[PDB]
Design a protein around this ligand. Sequence first.
Ligand SMILES: N=C(N)c1ccsc1
Ligand SMILES: [Ca+2]
Length: 223
Amino acid sequence: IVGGYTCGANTVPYQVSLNSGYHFCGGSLINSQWVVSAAHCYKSGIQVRLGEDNINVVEGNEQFISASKSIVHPSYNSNTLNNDIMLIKLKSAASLNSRVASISLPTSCASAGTQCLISGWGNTKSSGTSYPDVLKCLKAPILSDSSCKSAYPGQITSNMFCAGYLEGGKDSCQGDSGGPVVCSGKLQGIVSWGSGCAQKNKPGVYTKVCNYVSWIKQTIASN
Ligand SMILES: N=C(N)c1ccsc1
Ligand SMILES: [Ca+2]
């Protein structure tokens, strides 16, 4: 997260870290047994880390649970990142508490201009590299479809939306992928891609979760 702020320990209790020997992506807890992340975060041997603040220090509220299965969206296209969504099932149910909690799925899509909370442990610099250890947060509005498509001609589908600031300076970044965009208490986005980070006229691009609620609910119910 570039241009954000330190969330505070466990203030984003649905935020998870995906670990394969190291943190590589975020995710969002949607019930005690299931996490939703980006398809481009897929790999085998994922451990889901819940209750994290400093990802390099055991602080006492963590739960570490291996994934038992991953389900990449049937229409995911790794070339274009269309349908950049996956589900991860936990081998054992998380113990839900005030610091490990699920986030509700949308009942409808969110409007342009709605303010959202974007979070993660990704790079905090728009030129260069610095990774923060504690969770970072950014408040940012959903941008109009036309400004999104103007920023990325030929690359935006109906399964993507943009959020952030066209002036630059505030954005998600590498290492945030798979993590949450929460608006009005609902998981509306997944950190997906962008051009650089926090650059002018290049806002972040997010998977549009509201298009996937039926797929999520049916897939979980059958797996
Ligand atoms: N929002 C961005 N610039 C981004 C997201 C994943 S990698 C870069
Ligand atoms: Ca920790």
